Amino acid sequence: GHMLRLSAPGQLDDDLCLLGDVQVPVFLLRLGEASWALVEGGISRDAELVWADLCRWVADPSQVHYWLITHKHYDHCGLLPYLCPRLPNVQVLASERTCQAWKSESAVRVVERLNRQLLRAEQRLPEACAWDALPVRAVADGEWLELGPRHRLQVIEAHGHSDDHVVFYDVRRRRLFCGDALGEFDEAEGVWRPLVFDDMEAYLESLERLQRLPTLLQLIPGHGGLLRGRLAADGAESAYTECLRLCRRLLWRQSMGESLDELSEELHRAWGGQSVDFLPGELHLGSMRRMLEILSRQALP
Ligand SMILES: O=C(O)c1ccccc1-n1cccc1
Numbered sequence: 001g002h003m004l005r006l007s008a009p010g011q012l013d014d015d016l017c018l019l020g021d022v023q024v025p026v027f028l029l030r031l032g033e034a035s036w037a038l039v040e041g042g043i044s045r046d047a048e049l050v051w052a053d054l055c056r057w058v059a060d061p062s063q064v065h066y067w068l069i070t071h072k073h074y075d076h077c078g079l080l081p082y083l084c085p086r087l088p089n090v091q092v093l094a095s096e097r098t099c100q101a102w103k104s105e106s107a108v109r110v111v112e113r114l115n116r117q118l119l120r121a122e123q124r125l126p127e128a129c130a131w132d133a134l135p136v137r138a139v140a141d142g143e144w145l146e147l148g149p150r151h152r153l154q155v156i157e158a159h160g161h162s163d164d165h166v167v168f169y170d171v172r173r174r175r176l177f178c179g180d181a182l183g184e185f186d187e188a189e190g191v192w193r194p195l196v197f198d199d200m201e202a203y204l205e206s207l208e209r210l211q212r213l214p215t216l217l218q219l220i221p222g223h224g225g226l227l228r229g230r231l232a233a234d235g236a237e238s239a240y241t242e243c244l245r246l247c248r249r250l251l252w253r254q255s256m257g258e259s260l261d262e263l264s265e266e267l268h269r270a271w272g273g274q275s276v277d278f279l280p281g282e283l284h285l286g287s288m289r290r291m292l293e294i295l296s297r298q299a300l301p
Protein backbone atom coordinates (compact mmCIF):
# COMPACT_ATOMS: atom_id res chain seq x y z
CA GLY A 1 0.00 0.00 0.00
CA HIS A 2 2.08 2.88 -1.34
CA MET A 3 1.39 6.10 -3.22
CA LEU A 4 3.88 5.31 -5.99
CA ARG A 5 3.00 1.62 -6.46
CA LEU A 6 -0.31 0.29 -7.77
CA SER A 7 -0.51 -3.34 -6.63
CA ALA A 8 -4.19 -4.32 -6.80
CA PRO A 9 -6.04 -6.14 -9.59
CA GLY A 10 -8.40 -4.11 -11.74
CA GLN A 11 -8.02 -0.79 -13.51
CA LEU A 12 -4.65 0.98 -13.31
CA ASP A 13 -5.08 3.68 -15.97
CA ASP A 14 -7.70 4.83 -18.47
CA ASP A 15 -6.44 2.15 -20.89
CA LEU A 16 -4.79 -0.35 -18.53
CA CYS A 17 -5.96 -3.10 -16.19
CA LEU A 18 -4.18 -5.69 -14.06
CA LEU A 19 -5.49 -9.23 -14.48
CA GLY A 20 -4.84 -12.11 -12.12
CA ASP A 21 -2.31 -12.11 -9.29
CA VAL A 22 -0.19 -9.00 -8.78
CA GLN A 23 2.90 -11.18 -8.28
CA VAL A 24 2.51 -12.75 -11.75
CA PRO A 25 0.12 -10.34 -13.49
CA VAL A 26 -1.24 -10.13 -17.01
CA PHE A 27 -1.83 -6.57 -18.18
CA LEU A 28 -4.80 -5.64 -20.39
CA LEU A 29 -4.58 -2.73 -22.84
CA ARG A 30 -7.71 -1.31 -24.47
CA LEU A 31 -6.70 -0.34 -28.01
CA GLY A 32 -10.18 0.72 -29.09
CA GLU A 33 -13.86 0.14 -28.50
CA ALA A 34 -13.50 -3.37 -29.99
CA SER A 35 -9.77 -4.07 -29.74
CA TRP A 36 -7.59 -5.22 -26.83
CA ALA A 37 -4.06 -6.45 -26.14
CA LEU A 38 -2.31 -8.43 -23.41
CA VAL A 39 1.21 -8.00 -22.01
CA GLU A 40 3.14 -10.73 -20.12
CA GLY A 41 2.17 -14.41 -20.24
CA GLY A 42 2.02 -15.41 -16.57
CA ILE A 43 1.92 -18.96 -15.17
CA SER A 44 -0.18 -21.85 -16.42
CA ARG A 45 -2.15 -22.50 -13.23
CA ASP A 46 -3.61 -18.97 -13.39
CA ALA A 47 -5.40 -19.73 -16.69
CA GLU A 48 -8.89 -19.73 -15.19
CA LEU A 49 -8.22 -16.79 -12.86
CA VAL A 50 -6.87 -14.58 -15.66
CA TRP A 51 -9.63 -15.72 -18.02
CA ALA A 52 -12.25 -14.88 -15.38
CA ASP A 53 -10.80 -11.40 -14.86
CA LEU A 54 -10.47 -10.86 -18.61
CA CYS A 55 -14.11 -11.67 -19.39
CA ARG A 56 -15.23 -9.03 -16.87
CA TRP A 57 -13.61 -6.36 -19.08
CA VAL A 58 -13.89 -7.93 -22.56
CA ALA A 59 -17.40 -8.97 -23.56
CA ASP A 60 -16.11 -10.64 -26.75
CA PRO A 61 -12.73 -12.41 -26.36
CA SER A 62 -12.31 -12.39 -30.15
CA GLN A 63 -11.44 -8.68 -29.80
CA VAL A 64 -8.12 -9.61 -28.12
CA HIS A 65 -5.73 -9.18 -31.05
CA TYR A 66 -2.21 -9.05 -29.57
CA TRP A 67 -0.30 -10.69 -26.72
CA LEU A 68 3.12 -9.20 -25.98
CA ILE A 69 5.76 -11.42 -24.34
CA THR A 70 8.98 -10.19 -22.72
CA HIS A 71 10.94 -13.45 -22.45
CA LYS A 72 10.75 -17.24 -22.35
CA HIS A 73 10.86 -17.89 -18.59
CA TYR A 74 8.14 -20.22 -17.33
CA ASP A 75 6.48 -17.43 -15.32
CA HIS A 76 6.09 -15.16 -18.38
CA CYS A 77 4.57 -17.45 -21.03
CA GLY A 78 2.86 -20.35 -19.20
CA LEU A 79 -0.62 -19.07 -20.08
CA LEU A 80 -0.12 -19.09 -23.85
CA PRO A 81 -1.06 -22.73 -24.65
CA TYR A 82 -4.12 -22.62 -22.39
CA LEU A 83 -5.74 -19.27 -23.30
CA CYS A 84 -4.75 -18.81 -26.95
CA PRO A 85 -7.42 -21.43 -27.84
CA ARG A 86 -9.98 -19.08 -26.25
CA LEU A 87 -8.55 -16.06 -28.15
CA PRO A 88 -9.19 -16.88 -31.82
CA ASN A 89 -7.89 -13.58 -33.25
CA VAL A 90 -4.87 -13.10 -30.96
CA GLN A 91 -1.33 -12.85 -32.30
CA VAL A 92 1.57 -13.50 -29.92
CA LEU A 93 4.37 -10.94 -30.33
CA ALA A 94 7.74 -12.16 -29.06
CA SER A 95 11.43 -11.86 -29.84
CA GLU A 96 13.07 -14.22 -32.32
CA ARG A 97 14.96 -16.08 -29.59
CA THR A 98 11.81 -16.27 -27.47
CA CYS A 99 10.04 -17.91 -30.41
CA GLN A 100 12.90 -20.40 -30.80
CA ALA A 101 12.42 -21.55 -27.21
CA TRP A 102 8.84 -22.57 -28.04
CA LYS A 103 10.08 -24.69 -30.97
CA SER A 104 12.50 -26.59 -28.68
CA GLU A 105 11.11 -29.69 -26.98
CA SER A 106 13.75 -29.44 -24.24
CA ALA A 107 13.03 -25.77 -23.52
CA VAL A 108 9.28 -26.45 -23.53
CA ARG A 109 9.88 -29.43 -21.24
CA VAL A 110 11.35 -27.15 -18.57
CA VAL A 111 8.58 -24.55 -18.89
CA GLU A 112 5.89 -27.20 -18.45
CA ARG A 113 7.73 -28.90 -15.57
CA LEU A 114 8.09 -25.72 -13.49
CA ASN A 115 4.48 -24.71 -14.16
CA ARG A 116 3.08 -28.10 -13.13
CA GLN A 117 4.78 -27.76 -9.74
CA LEU A 118 2.58 -24.69 -9.13
CA LEU A 119 -0.66 -26.59 -9.80
CA ARG A 120 -2.94 -26.98 -6.80
CA ALA A 121 -3.98 -30.49 -5.81
CA GLU A 122 -6.72 -31.79 -8.12
CA GLN A 123 -6.40 -28.71 -10.37
CA ARG A 124 -7.05 -29.36 -14.06
CA LEU A 125 -5.70 -27.32 -16.99
CA PRO A 126 -7.78 -26.41 -20.08
CA GLU A 127 -7.31 -27.92 -23.53
CA ALA A 128 -3.89 -26.59 -24.50
CA CYS A 129 -2.48 -25.57 -27.86
CA ALA A 130 0.80 -27.09 -28.98
CA TRP A 131 3.70 -24.84 -28.01
CA ASP A 132 4.99 -25.04 -31.59
CA ALA A 133 1.50 -24.17 -32.90
CA LEU A 134 1.04 -20.84 -31.12
CA PRO A 135 -0.06 -17.80 -33.40
CA VAL A 136 3.32 -16.13 -32.94
CA ARG A 137 4.87 -13.26 -34.89
CA ALA A 138 8.57 -12.64 -34.30
CA VAL A 139 9.48 -9.01 -33.56
CA ALA A 140 12.93 -7.45 -33.81
CA ASP A 141 14.88 -4.90 -31.78
CA GLY A 142 13.70 -1.35 -32.45
CA GLU A 143 10.53 -2.43 -34.26
CA TRP A 144 7.43 -0.30 -33.73
CA LEU A 145 4.23 -2.17 -32.83
CA GLU A 146 1.21 -0.34 -34.27
CA LEU A 147 -1.29 -1.88 -31.86
CA GLY A 148 -3.89 0.88 -32.18
CA PRO A 149 -4.48 4.54 -33.03
CA ARG A 150 -3.33 5.60 -29.54
CA HIS A 151 -0.98 2.68 -28.74
CA ARG A 152 2.43 2.58 -30.45
CA LEU A 153 5.01 0.49 -28.57
CA GLN A 154 8.67 0.00 -29.48
CA VAL A 155 10.55 -3.28 -29.03
CA ILE A 156 13.84 -2.74 -27.18
CA GLU A 157 16.26 -5.62 -26.71
CA ALA A 158 17.15 -6.00 -23.02
CA HIS A 159 19.32 -9.10 -22.68
CA GLY A 160 21.06 -10.04 -19.44
CA HIS A 161 18.33 -11.47 -17.25
CA SER A 162 17.82 -13.95 -20.10
CA ASP A 163 19.42 -14.19 -23.53
CA ASP A 164 16.07 -13.45 -25.23
CA HIS A 165 14.63 -10.68 -23.06
CA VAL A 166 12.92 -7.64 -24.59
CA VAL A 167 10.94 -4.69 -23.25
CA PHE A 168 8.10 -2.62 -24.69
CA TYR A 169 8.09 1.18 -24.52
CA ASP A 170 4.95 3.31 -25.00
CA VAL A 171 6.54 6.71 -25.58
CA ARG A 172 3.15 8.46 -25.76
CA ARG A 173 2.53 7.52 -22.12
CA ARG A 174 6.16 7.31 -20.95
CA ARG A 175 5.29 3.71 -20.02
CA LEU A 176 7.80 0.85 -20.05
CA PHE A 177 6.91 -2.84 -19.71
CA CYS A 178 10.36 -3.90 -18.49
CA GLY A 179 9.73 -7.53 -17.50
CA ASP A 180 12.56 -8.75 -15.26
CA ALA A 181 15.29 -6.62 -16.87
CA LEU A 182 15.52 -4.40 -13.78
CA GLY A 183 15.20 -7.29 -11.31
CA GLU A 184 12.65 -7.94 -8.59
CA PHE A 185 11.22 -4.88 -6.86
CA ASP A 186 11.47 -5.22 -3.08
CA GLU A 187 8.02 -4.32 -1.75
CA ALA A 188 9.18 -3.96 1.86
CA GLU A 189 12.31 -1.87 1.20
CA GLY A 190 11.52 -0.07 -2.06
CA VAL A 191 14.68 -1.10 -3.93
CA TRP A 192 15.37 -3.42 -6.85
CA ARG A 193 16.70 -6.95 -6.33
CA PRO A 194 18.99 -7.92 -9.25
CA LEU A 195 18.02 -10.93 -11.39
CA VAL A 196 21.17 -11.68 -13.41
CA PHE A 197 20.62 -15.24 -14.67
CA ASP A 198 22.44 -15.13 -18.03
CA ASP A 199 24.99 -12.34 -18.61
CA MET A 200 26.00 -9.52 -16.27
CA GLU A 201 27.64 -7.31 -18.89
CA ALA A 202 24.56 -7.46 -21.11
CA TYR A 203 22.36 -6.96 -18.03
CA LEU A 204 24.15 -3.72 -17.14
CA GLU A 205 24.41 -2.65 -20.79
CA SER A 206 20.64 -3.03 -21.18
CA LEU A 207 19.99 -0.85 -18.13
CA GLU A 208 22.34 1.79 -19.55
CA ARG A 209 20.31 1.94 -22.77
CA LEU A 210 17.00 2.07 -20.88
CA GLN A 211 18.30 4.96 -18.77
CA ARG A 212 18.55 6.99 -21.99
CA LEU A 213 14.81 6.73 -22.68
CA PRO A 214 12.74 9.87 -22.14
CA THR A 215 11.78 10.29 -18.49
CA LEU A 216 9.40 7.47 -17.57
CA LEU A 217 6.03 8.09 -15.96
CA GLN A 218 5.01 4.43 -15.49
CA LEU A 219 7.32 1.45 -14.95
CA ILE A 220 5.70 -1.99 -15.16
CA PRO A 221 7.97 -4.97 -14.34
CA GLY A 222 7.05 -8.63 -14.63
CA HIS A 223 6.18 -8.91 -10.92
CA GLY A 224 4.66 -6.59 -8.33
CA GLY A 225 2.39 -4.19 -10.23
CA LEU A 226 2.83 -0.66 -11.61
CA LEU A 227 5.42 1.86 -10.42
CA ARG A 228 5.14 5.62 -10.92
CA GLY A 229 6.61 8.90 -9.71
CA ARG A 230 10.29 8.78 -8.82
CA LEU A 231 10.25 4.96 -8.84
CA ALA A 232 9.55 5.01 -12.58
CA ALA A 233 11.82 7.96 -13.37
CA ASP A 234 14.79 6.50 -11.45
CA GLY A 235 14.02 2.82 -12.11
CA ALA A 236 16.67 1.91 -14.68
CA GLU A 237 19.39 3.84 -12.83
CA SER A 238 18.49 2.38 -9.43
CA ALA A 239 18.41 -1.16 -10.83
CA TYR A 240 21.89 -0.49 -12.22
CA THR A 241 23.15 0.70 -8.83
CA GLU A 242 21.69 -2.29 -6.98
CA CYS A 243 23.42 -4.71 -9.36
CA LEU A 244 26.84 -3.15 -8.76
CA ARG A 245 26.02 -3.11 -5.05
CA LEU A 246 25.47 -6.88 -5.12
CA CYS A 247 28.73 -7.35 -7.04
CA ARG A 248 30.78 -5.42 -4.48
CA ARG A 249 28.98 -7.34 -1.73
CA LEU A 250 29.88 -10.61 -3.46
CA LEU A 251 33.54 -9.59 -3.82
CA TRP A 252 33.66 -8.62 -0.14
CA ARG A 253 32.32 -12.00 0.97
CA GLN A 254 34.57 -14.07 -1.31
CA SER A 255 37.61 -12.04 -0.24
CA MET A 256 36.84 -13.31 3.28
CA GLY A 257 37.12 -16.95 2.17
CA GLU A 258 33.34 -17.35 1.91
CA SER A 259 31.88 -19.78 -0.60
CA LEU A 260 29.17 -18.82 -3.08
CA ASP A 261 26.79 -21.05 -1.11
CA GLU A 262 27.22 -18.80 1.94
CA LEU A 263 25.76 -15.69 0.29
CA SER A 264 23.35 -17.81 -1.78
CA GLU A 265 21.51 -19.07 1.31
CA GLU A 266 21.50 -15.52 2.69
CA LEU A 267 20.00 -14.06 -0.49
CA HIS A 268 17.50 -16.93 -0.71
CA ARG A 269 16.43 -16.43 2.92
CA ALA A 270 16.26 -12.64 2.52
CA TRP A 271 14.63 -12.54 -0.94
CA GLY A 272 12.94 -15.91 -1.52
CA GLY A 273 9.84 -15.04 0.49
CA GLN A 274 8.33 -12.72 -2.11
CA SER A 275 8.15 -15.28 -4.94
CA VAL A 276 7.36 -18.39 -2.87
CA ASP A 277 3.75 -18.63 -4.08
CA PHE A 278 4.78 -18.95 -7.75
CA LEU A 279 8.46 -20.01 -7.61
CA PRO A 280 9.65 -23.33 -6.12
CA GLY A 281 12.02 -22.69 -3.24
CA GLU A 282 14.71 -24.81 -4.87
CA LEU A 283 14.47 -22.73 -8.04
CA HIS A 284 15.01 -19.47 -6.13
CA LEU A 285 18.01 -20.75 -4.15
CA GLY A 286 19.45 -22.21 -7.34
CA SER A 287 18.72 -18.98 -9.20
CA MET A 288 20.56 -17.01 -6.50
CA ARG A 289 23.44 -19.48 -6.90
CA ARG A 290 23.48 -19.15 -10.69
CA MET A 291 23.50 -15.35 -10.38
CA LEU A 292 26.43 -15.20 -7.96
CA GLU A 293 28.29 -17.65 -10.19
CA ILE A 294 27.73 -15.26 -13.11
CA LEU A 295 28.85 -12.21 -11.14
CA SER A 296 31.92 -14.07 -9.85
CA ARG A 297 33.09 -15.04 -13.34
CA GLN A 298 32.55 -11.57 -14.83
CA ALA A 299 34.34 -9.94 -11.86
CA LEU A 300 37.21 -11.93 -10.34
CA PRO A 301 40.98 -12.64 -10.66
O1 LIG B 1 12.93 -14.35 -13.34
C1 LIG B 1 12.33 -14.53 -12.24
O2 LIG B 1 11.14 -14.15 -12.10
C2 LIG B 1 13.04 -15.21 -11.09
C3 LIG B 1 13.20 -14.53 -9.89
C4 LIG B 1 13.83 -15.13 -8.82
C5 LIG B 1 14.31 -16.42 -8.93
C6 LIG B 1 14.15 -17.11 -10.13
C7 LIG B 1 13.52 -16.52 -11.20
N1 LIG B 1 13.38 -17.21 -12.35
C8 LIG B 1 14.40 -17.66 -13.10
C9 LIG B 1 13.89 -18.32 -14.20
C10 LIG B 1 12.50 -18.27 -14.08
C11 LIG B 1 12.22 -17.57 -12.92
Ligand SMILES: [Fe+3]
Nearest residue numbers: 073076161180
Ligand atom coordinates in the same frame (compact mmCIF):
# COMPACT_ATOMS: atom_id res chain seq x y z
FE1 LIG C 1 12.34 -14.03 -15.62
Ligand SMILES: [Fe+3]
Nearest residue numbers: 073075180222
Ligand atom coordinates in the same frame (compact mmCIF):
# COMPACT_ATOMS: atom_id res chain seq x y z
FE1 LIG D 1 10.18 -13.64 -13.95
